[PDB]
Structure formats: structure tokens, C-alpha cells
Design a protein around this ligand. Structure first.
Ligand SMILES: NC(=O)c1ccc[n+]([C@@H]2O[C@H](COP(=O)([O-])OP(=O)(O)OC[C@H]3O[C@@H](n4cnc5c(N)ncnc54)[C@H](O)[C@@H]3O)[C@@H](O)[C@H]2O)c1
Ligand SMILES: NC(=O)c1ccc[n+]([C@@H]2O[C@H](COP(=O)([O-])OP(=O)(O)OC[C@H]3O[C@@H](n4cnc5c(N)ncnc54)[C@H](O)[C@@H]3O)[C@@H](O)[C@H]2O)c1
Ligand SMILES: NC(=O)c1ccc[n+]([C@@H]2O[C@H](COP(=O)([O-])OP(=O)(O)OC[C@H]3O[C@@H](n4cnc5c(N)ncnc54)[C@H](O)[C@@H]3O)[C@@H](O)[C@H]2O)c1
Ligand SMILES: NC(=O)c1ccc[n+]([C@@H]2O[C@H](COP(=O)([O-])OP(=O)(O)OC[C@H]3O[C@@H](n4cnc5c(N)ncnc54)[C@H](O)[C@@H]3O)[C@@H](O)[C@H]2O)c1
Lengths: 336, 335, 336, 336
């Protein structure tokens, strides 16, 4: 080991990927860049979390103007806006997590290579960097690629479920709806959002529809499913945890029980850790802190017939995805 | 000149009263609720968290058993059993059964003992004839004294499905409703014997729930019996819900063809029942909308010409309350 | 014969100040500037509102890139960043409502005079522009003052109440707490807020303590109270409508009924329309749309004794204030 | 050996008092009564919680329809409405936690004795049963008392704070305000609530004033402060964690720093575990899970002068209080 990483954008995903790395045995966080959060403010934002509780694993302290100590393990802090000016090499950061939400293009994210980084993992979909979803197509990653995308948390939820359903029963066509928690891009009160008008309306007092390429993106990581899936979303007044509502038409007829057995076995086999399976009366909060990418809700789903069903799968959009960012880094690091 | 009474002065009861009191043809003459005194009733009727204060008329008490809406008298009852309510004394011909505990045909029929002539159950009934305005209210016959106006969800789903089925032919469909919280839910994790998920804190959880609204469409549109079903997700909003209907259709149709069909329907026969919008609206923009189903053109999406996802809004409280009154109007015109 | 005004910053307050003007008999909105809201987006943001309902008093349309049509009446639209670059006189705007939140300094707010504007009303506290509060000290205004502040929504609620109490009973000292709805400066989720750390935390899932000079500002508009009042604030998960909680030790002993009586008298007299009086079991949503600056809740308060009492007054922080912005302009227009 | 307790009313407090017992080393939960929660349903309500996470401390099994298995320890389950009919003795429950909220009268709670219980601790204020607050007057308890009250969560937060301020500076008089999270007695939508009209209004969409004698109650556990304190509450849209806002006029002049010091000193000494002290930018969710009764927030408070100040103290109305119920039981058992 240890695998040395840096994080650009110490936000919801940035801070949680830090918790995952800090709690790991094989990954070492060595640097964090965010020009909007000072070293001092960084210890506060990292220690306290409205959703995932207070950090109690180690002690948080400031060594100096730009060095955090987690315990004492040292973490360099940067406050640079331009990625091509971040000296990642100085801190030994081999892998950089691009979780700012503004450098998703391959060309922008590649700016990190200038300061000495060897690999960059974009914490969101990318238009030109290849996307990988763990448990679905991460084995397609080749080490000659230096900039990749870990897709969206929604694709990480739907992709695993669709692969199981497709492998077992064959998917003819499917439509997805995700009841999604509010996020950083939304507004507390009605305000401007030029590219997403509905997105500008007060987040916690409205059900706000939105478009999403998360379902269609499944066709990129699973080519056989190209053009057979798409969907949309409804952002709702909850702080975290979202759910996928997949309406699918399958080729091979199968009872609901049959579908439940296929998912259960997958959650216990090759996709253990990625896809979960519950059969209780759970609600959103019960999934806070769940590290799986997709937790199938057995009792919530409903079948119209043996070839037309609606499947339900939860996902802690912040926690599960953050764990997948790390898992993808772990796999890239084990490649070759 | 239609005289009505309301049993259960709750969310639906109070709003149905607002519609009636603001109507020219309907007259509320009596209200019954054992858990709300006459004085408290004036407060619960005047102030509303979501539909604003009532200023249409002055609200005052005359006596302990009589309210005055500006200048019209409204008798107040506090009876527990429906078969003890002297509806006729107040001259109430139609009784809106909105308590939520008397949906059985035989239980609602209790209002007839007090002299009521017809009863309209503000909810689905296991055995009472069901009618949805704009869908099958014309199947109503004057010999029927007890009917169901179905659920707000079914009122949203039914009209829409009828338009798509008649134009395009729905082979199969699955619906999900993102629904506002209601009175049956809890503020904090509490006991809900018949619905565990529903006992969990209402405004701090996405809460899955089962719904018969989709299956009930089969009762008002026979050709869709067994062709639809679904579920629901209760979310942290105070009112206004939305139906997401995914359907496979017989006749191939572009999304634009589907939009115009709905738009046409909204400007014709179903005008006032089904609405059509093509703006970036959100939930609160629908508070106070009297339609049963408001199609969101921009929210919906189609995978191909035979498989699509349609989105329709509905103020579960206000639109339904209006339908309750519309059914009464229709029944009253039925010889 | 109308007072021609313009609005810089088409936000919560700018948009509602616009609703008030458009429906008035004496003020005419002739121009609005907001570099973040295009002309067509402006018609959408103005028409629909999560808290105050849809605009139905008149039709809304776009005459041209650059002109709106509010019930057959034209409103010029600008999208200029720098205030000194706004051609207000072109639109004929005599009064400018500075509601962007970023130009509260008297010398920054004065940039509007460059474009031909004659008077500027800052919709917020100002460190160097004088503050006036309707019902408290607006008559102190003289026509040679060209830049003024309408204070804060909280001071507009606190000032009138404090005045009545002080004039009748004499305030020895007081401490205020405002349980305030969330606003645009807050975040949907745990986000950066360098000047107000607490204010960065998820808005609708936390009680959030906050500093405020609203009680201290009372000294500016009411000299004899200078230094005798101060306070704090808690931001809670509501969309609009706030409440002031004033605890005061008074010089003249008075029963709670006598205190209630003084406030009622004022609400029916000199302070009608500014201070309101309620004796019913109301809650926050019952005040949405109330135009008063301070609605005294007679039942919610409690006195420990005849010289120490806790008084409660509600205020639609958005609507009440917006109406006061207009009332101040009307007053200034009548001066000299 | 172990203090064997029984719980009547498996609600928020009842279930969290159970978690505390089940995690202690000295307390043994042996019986639970709740006629509205079946034995099977009980495991589900006990295991998952919207606020305090999933119970992971020990496994949960159902031995049969009358008993649960928690970490191999049997817990009898009753479903009896009338308290006088619960055979506490049969289970071995010595102390009974009366947490239904309907049997707070001394004579009504005494019903638990006819079934075999020796002591009854009511988890709410009582009109006549002796009230005790750990760290304030729990030593006033005498073995001849079999039925006591552990006061309210609010009085538990305020009393310890007032005791410290009074012992150090002397409290001449004070007025309190509590910004409180919603509770089970409130309603999801505007519904009937005859004894509390405001409390019938939509809980998560309104700021709801409410009366409260939690402040007047301090004079009960703290005789010297009788008639020196009172106040009221504001229920707001949060799921848990409330805060006390105390405005007090003190006798001995003290700078804010000296007051902070006195509180920090008490939090590290005699009142350790009861009173807490924080000097950071925290928000409500940061206190979820805190076991103290009162957490002083140094930075949130403000002083007008050395004799008139506003003190802020947080409390997880659910958790802090549940821990104190166990502590009161511990003290009673230790003073048999
Ligand atoms: N929140 C989720 O549920 C979720 C799940 C999966 C993927 N994502 C994706 O992760 C990304 C970040 O999402 P988030 O919710 O954590 O956002 P966020 O807003 O919480 O965090 C983004 C961080 O980027 C920082 N930042 C801004 N400009 C910067 C710059 N030039 N250099 C360095 N740092 C900068 C910000 O100060 C902020 O702390 C987005 O692309 C998002 O779509 C989010
Ligand atoms: N709220 C909605 O969105 C909605 C929409 C459509 C249909 N419905 C249906 O309407 C019914 C009521 O729903 P709601 O949300 O208005 O509920 P609610 O709880 O707000 O109102 C029900 C009222 O019934 C009263 N009541 C109880 N027992 C009574 C009795 N024996 N006699 C007289 N009155 C009595 C209550 O005191 C209460 O005021 C239910 O069957 C519900 O499923 C609700
Ligand atoms: N919302 C309230 O409760 C309230 C009440 C009283 C006073 N205020 C004060 O009013 C001001 C605005 O508050 P708000 O809640 O309406 O804020 P907001 O964020 O809703 O609106 C501010 C508007 O300013 C625009 N803007 C930004 N930069 C600009 C520029 N250079 N030129 C022109 N427009 C620009 C934005 O695009 C936005 O639409 C603040 O100073 C605030 O303190 C707010
Ligand atoms: N934050 C808080 O919620 C808090 C803090 C301090 C004190 N308290 C007090 O604790 C008590 C309970 O409050 P809660 O919030 O836990 O309420 P809750 O409604 O969550 O729980 C009460 C439980 O009592 C059960 N119950 C009802 N009648 C019963 C009977 N006859 N026999 C046995 N069980 C019965 C219910 O089924 C329910 O599970 C109240 O007196 C309250 O004032 C509450």
C-alpha cells in the first residue's frame, strides 16, 4: 500500500470519501483542496455532519496554516481555484478525487495531472472520460487511462439492479423514477437557477421534478442494454438517502418470488457489498450509513404480471457512492 | 338549493364545506364531528395551514349548536354513531361521509336513518358503487343511495388513463404516486398496527406504501381491469401529490402526439377535470387547483413510441373536495 | 401621478416589493435589474411563488428582449452587474430599491445616482446610510437625504413594539430572540459559509443559532433605547414568517392586561397597519400575507411579574417588510 | 445485583430508556407493557429508529408471543391497558417507568403497585408526585416515597443551568423560552386537539407557540427559585433536540467570560454528565445522542451587561431525558 489520495472539493462527497479513506487500512488521504474552506474551517466541517454524525474515530487538529492532523496523521490543505496549479505531487497524492462538480469534463479534470497526480477519479458522470460502476463494468478499466468517472450515485443504484434482472430474466425495456433527497445545487428559498428552473424553487417545501441521464447511462456501462432504459426524478424534502423506482418489462416470465431470489443470491454472491437485499418495513433514514450501492426493497415492489414489474432499491446517495469512489480507486490501483 | 351535511369535519370535510359555501347551487346546512365543539369548529374552519384563512364571509357562533357563515345558519352536531344524526332536521338531503371510518356500504347507510336521502363517501368503498367525475359518473342511476367518490389518487389517475386508453390503448401500466403526508401518519415514530412503515416519522422519511388506487381504476373503466397496479412513496410535503404512470400502448405514438391528445381533452369534455401545463412548475404551484389531474408535459418522458412515463399533479385535498361536490351536483340532476 | 421606482435585485424582497407596487394606486414599477435573471426567466420567477401564491392580478408577457408587459404596462429589464452602469433615468426610475444584499454601504448604494436615479432605498441595514422604520422614526427623514435604509425585517418588528412598551412603561433593559424562517443565504445541505459557520449547515434539518444586530439597531431609530437592548436569533425549518420574543424589565409596573391594552390601542391608533393585535391560537402560516410589521400575539406571551415580561410578535419577514419598503418611498415622496 | 425494571409505554422515551438499560451494566430490563404494540411489532419499533439509528448493540429474537430475546436476555411483553392489571411482580420488575403520558397523577401511577412493583418513576411532570432532577435535588429522595416524577426534559435542561448560575451569581428573576422539536402529541396535518388548539396545526410546517410550566417547575426542585422563573415554548419543524433560551437578571455582576467559566467548571466537576459545555459553532443535530441534561452553548449566548444576560443550553429531549430516568432509578436503588 498505502494508496495515497488527494481530494478536490471538500463537500458532501469530498468529506465522506475522506471518512471512508481515513477509516480504511489500504487508503491514505494526504491532501485536500478547496478555496472556499480554510484549514481552520475544514476541521469543523469534517468533524460535524448533520447526516452522518460526528467524527469520533480520531482527533481533529490543525498543525498550521495548511496542514491538518487526523490524529496526527498529517494532511496538506490547499486553497487553489485552478486545478492545474495544485501541487499534488508535493504531498505524494497519486490519485485525485474530483468532487467539485465543476471539472467533470476529461480535459478539465486532467488539469490535476499538471501538478503531479497520476490518476483522477471524477465523482460524477463525465461527457468524455469513461464511466465505471463497481460490480457492473469496473473490470473494463485499463491502466493506460488516467482520467475516469465513477458515474452518478443514481446510476450506481440502478446499474447493479438492472444487470441482475437482465442476466436472469432479460430486459426488454425499462423506465426509472428516483425519489431523490435534496442536494447542494438546490435552493433554500425560491431563487435563480438558470439551467434548471424548477431546481431554483425552495427545496424543502416542494416536490421538484428533474431530468436525469442516470438510467440511460446504464446503457453505457452495460452496452447490451443500450437504448432500453431512461427515466426521470422527483427531488423531495429529505436531507439524504434516495430510492430507485424501476418499471421493467422482462423477456423470461418470472414470479415476484423468483425475482426476489435472484437479487437475494446476487447480494450474497458476486455483488455482495454492492447490492443489498431487505425484506422489512424500512423507511429512508434506516438506510443512512448503508455502504451498498443499491439495496433492494423486497416488500415495497409490486408485480403486475410475470413480465411486468416495478422494483424498488434504496441508496444513501452520499455514503454508498463515497464508498464506491474508494472501491474504484482500490481496483484501479490493483490493475496490472 | 342543494342542501348537504358533512360528517367528519377534517381535511376533506372542511374543504368540501369551503367549496359548498362558495358555490351558488350548493348549501351546507349541517356539520357533525364528536371531536370538535362548535367553538373549536369556527377556529378549525377559519384558519388553514395550506389553503389560507377564510375571508369569504364572517364566521361566528349563534348558539352552541349553530354556526353562521356571514348570514347563513349551519347546524352543528357532535354525535358518534351516524344512525343517530337527525340530518333531516337540518334539511340535509345529501351527506358527505368524510370521517374515514364509515366507508362500508352498510355503515354509511346509517345516515339514511336520520332522514338523509343520499350519502357520498369521500373515499374508496369495499362495496359501495364507485364514480369518478369525467370517467364514469354517467353510470350513476337515481336508485343508488350510497356511492363512493373513490380516492384522490384514483381521481388523478382515472381521467388521464381514460384519455390515453381511448387514444392509444393501454396494454399495461404501473403507477407510483409521490404523495404528501396525511392525517393517518405520525409526527415521530409511533404505533401503526396496520401499516408499520406508516408509523415512522412522517416529515423526516421517504415512506413506501401500498395503494389500491391503480387497481380500482378497473372499477370505473372495465377495459382497464387488471391492466394497472402500483404503489406509493409518502414524502415530507404538507399537500399536493403526483402520479407517475408508466404505460405500454397499442398504438404507436410520439410524445408530442400524446401531449396534444391530453391538451385537447383538457380544453374539451374533461375541461375542469384534467388540466394541461407545459411550464417548469413544482408542487406548491398547484395548491388550490380544482382539477383532478394536471398533466405535466415537460416532466414526462418516453423511451419509445409504445412505452412512456406520464406525470400528473393533483392537490389531493382541494381537487378531490371539488369532485365530491361535482358528484353531488350530477347525482342531483339524475332523474 | 405616480412615483416611478426601479428595483435592483429581483429576489424574494425585490419580487414582492414589485407585487406591492404593481397593485398599488400610487407607485409605478418602471424597471428591474438582475444580471442573474433573464427577461423570460423573470416572468416565471415573478409569476410563481412557493409562499405567496401565483400572481393573478394581471397578465404577464414579454414584449421584447428587454421589456416586460405587466397588464399592458411596460417594465424595462436590465442585467447589469455594476450599479453605476445602470441607466435608471432612461426608464424614468426616480426611486431605486437596492435589494441585492450586496450594496448596503451608502457609497455603494449611491452608484445608482450615476444613472440618473434620485433616491435609493436599501432593503437592509446599512453601516453608514440612515435607517428609518415606519411608525418609529420615518418623520425624521428630510428631502436632502438621498440614500436610506429601511432597516431589517426583524428591526421593523421589534422597533414598533419596543416603542409602545417604552412610551407607556419605560424599558430599563431588554433581550430579544427571533425564531426566524430560513432565507437565501442559508444552505440546503452542509455547505461553505465562511462568515457564518453555523449558517452553512443544512437549513431545514437544524435549529441554527445566529447573531443579529436587529435589537442593537433599535438604538439608531430610537435613541433613548440605545444600549438598552440586544439579542440573538435561531433559524428554524420554515419557509417564511418569523417571530420576535422580547424579554424586558420595565420601569412602570403594569399587569399583562394593561400591557395588552396599550398595544391594542396603538394597533387601533397611530400605529395601525404597522403593529397588529391578535388574541387567537394562531401559528406561523396564519400570518403569511399579513402586511403589518409587528403582530402582537397576546396569548403567547407571559409575565413573571409587573416589571418583567416576555412579549411575542409575529412578522411575515418577506411580505411585511416589502410593504414597508413601499410605505417608506411613499413617505419620502411626500416630504417637502 | 442488577436493578430490574419494567417499562409501561414503549414510545419514544420508553424505547430509548430501554436502549439505555440494555446497554448499562447495572440495569436489567425485564418487562415491557404496551397494548398497542404487539410482541412482534415491538422488535421492529425497537430495532429501527428515525433519529437514533439502528440498534446494533445486541441481537433481537422472539422466543414466543410473550417474550423477546435481547442479547440472550429474556424480556416479558404485556399488552394491558389498565395499569392495575399488569403483573409486574411476575416478571421481577422492581421499578416501573411510567412512560405512557396518561398516568402522571400519583394515584393513577400507583396502580402499578397492585401488580407487584415497588417503585414507580413517572417520565413527566406530576401534579402531586414528588419531582426530582438528577444533579439538582435527587438527594431529597427518601425510601418512603414509592412514586416519584423525573420532571420534564425541559426542566431537566433548565434546572441544572439555573442551579449553577444561581449558586455563583444569584438569580434575581428569569424568563425562559424553549425552541422545541415536534413530539408525538402533535399532528402531521391540521387536526383536532381540544386541549391545545395551536398544537393541532401541522407540526412540520409551522412554528407553534405553546405554554409550559417547565420553568415554573424549577422552583419545585430548587425552592430558593420559586416564583423567580417562568416562560413558554415554540415548537418547530425538527425531529429531535430542543434548546433553552434563558434571560436572567443576576445579583453579582459577572462578565460573560466569568459565567462561561462557572459553567465550564460545573461541567467538569459535581455536575459532570449532567451539564455540558461547548464553545463551537454547533447546530441541533450535533447534539443528537448527547447524554447530558443541559449543554451550555458558550458562543450562542449574549450579555447586555454584567447583570443581564441570555444563556443558551441544548438538550436531546429524548436521549438526555431517557438517561436521567435510569439515573434516578439508580439513585433510588442506592438509597433504599
Ligand atoms: N451529494 C450527492 O448525493 C452526490 C452523490 C454522487 C455524486 N455526486 C457528485 O459529486 C460532486 C460534488 O457533489 P457534493 O454534493 O459533494 O457537492 P458540494 O457542493 O457539497 O461540494 C462541492 C465542494 O467543491 C468545492 N469547490 C468549489 N469550487 C472548487 C474549486 N475550484 N476547487 C476545489 N474545490 C472547489 C466547494 O467549496 C465544495 O465544498 C458533484 O459533481 C455531484 O454531482 C453527489
Ligand atoms: N386528505 C386527503 O388527501 C384525502 C383525499 C381524498 C380522500 N380522503 C379520504 O377522506 C377521509 C378523511 O380524510 P382526512 O384527511 O380529511 O382526515 P381527517 O382526519 O383530517 O378528518 C376526519 C374527521 O373525521 C372526524 N371524525 C372521526 N370520527 C367521527 C365520527 N364518528 N363522526 C363524525 N366525525 C368523525 C374527525 O374528528 C376528523 O375531523 C378518509 O377516508 C380519507 O382516506 C383524503
Ligand atoms: N428575505 C427576507 O426575509 C428579508 C427581509 C428583510 C430584508 N432582507 C434583505 O433584502 C436583501 C435581499 O434579500 P432576499 O431574501 O430578497 O435575497 P435573494 O437572494 O432572494 O435576492 C437577491 C437578488 O439579488 C440579485 N443580484 C445579485 N447580484 C446582483 C447585482 N450585482 N445586481 C443586481 N441584482 C443582483 C440576485 O440574482 C437575486 O435575485 C438582503 O440585503 C436582505 O438582508 C431580506
Ligand atoms: N422528548 C420527549 O418526547 C419527552 C421528553 C421528556 C418527557 N416526556 C414525557 O414522556 C411521556 C411519553 O412521551 P413520548 O414522547 O415517549 O410518547 P409516545 O407517544 O412516543 O409513547 C407513548 C407510548 O405509550 C403507549 N401507551 C399508550 N397508552 C398506554 C397504556 N394504557 N398502557 C401502556 N402503554 C400505553 C403508546 O402505545 C406509546 O408507544 C410523556 O408523559 C411525555 O410528556 C417526553
Amino acid at each position: 500500500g498505502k494508496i495515497k489520495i488527494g481530494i478536490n472539493g471538500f463537500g458532501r462527497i469530498g468529506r465522506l470519501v475522506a471518512r471512508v479513506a481515513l477509516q480504511s487500512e489500504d487508503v491514505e488521504l494526504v491532501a485536500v483542496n478547496d478555496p472556499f474552506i480554510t484549514t481552520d474551517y475544514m476541521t469543523y466541517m469534517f468533524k460535524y455532519d448533520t447526516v452522518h454524525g460526528q467524527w469520533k474515530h480520531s482527533d481533529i487538529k490543525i498543525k498550521d496554516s495548511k496542514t491538518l492532523l487526523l490524529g496526527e496523521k498529517p494532511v496538506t490543505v490547499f486553497g487553489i481555484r485552478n486545478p492545474d496549479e495544485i501541487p499534488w505531487a508535493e504531498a505524494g497524492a497519486e490519485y485525485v478525487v474530483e468532487s467539485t462538480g465543476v471539472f467533470t469534463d476529461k480535459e478539465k479534470a486532467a488539469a490535476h495531472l499538471k501538478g503531479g497526480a497520476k490518476k483522477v477519479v471524477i465523482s460524477a458522470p463525465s461527457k468524455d472520460a469513461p464511466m465505471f460502476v463497481c460490480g457492473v463494468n469496473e473490470d473494463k478499466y485499463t491502466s493506460d487511462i488516467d482520467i475516469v468517472s465513477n458515474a452518478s450515485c443514481t446510476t450506481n443504484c440502478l446499474a447493479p439492479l438492472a444487470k441482475v434482472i437482465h442476466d436472469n430474466f432479460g430486459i426488454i425495456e425499462g423506465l426509472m423514477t428516483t425519489v431523490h433527497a435534496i442536494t447542494a445545487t438546490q435552493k433554500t428559498v425560491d431563487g435563480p437557477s438558470s439551467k434548471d428552473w424548477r431546481g431554483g424553487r425552495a427545496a424543502s417545501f416542494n416536490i421538484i421534478p428533474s431530468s436525469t441521464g442516470a438510467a440511460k447511462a446504464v446503457g453505457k456501462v452495460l452496452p447490451d442494454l443500450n437504448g432500453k432504459l431512461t427515466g426521470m426524478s422527483f427531488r423531495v424534502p429529505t436531507v439524504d438517502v434516495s430510492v430507485v423506482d424501476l418499471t421493467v418489462r422482462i423477456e423470461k416470465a418470472a414470479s415476484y418470488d423468483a425475482i426476489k431470489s435472484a437479487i437475494k443470491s446476487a447480494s450474497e454472491g458476486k455483488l455482495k457489498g454492492i447490492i443489498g437485499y431487505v425484506e422489512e418495513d424500512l423507511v429512508s433514514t434506516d438506510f443512512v450509513g448503508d455502504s451498498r450501492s443499491s439495496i433492494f426493497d423486497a416488500k415495497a415492489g409490486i408485480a403486475l404480471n410475470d413480465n411486468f414489474v416495478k422494483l424498488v432499491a434504496w441508496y444513501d446517495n452520499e455514503w454508498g457512492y463515497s464508498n464506491r469512489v474508494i472501491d474504484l480507486i482500490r481496483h484501479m490501483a490493483k490493475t496490472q
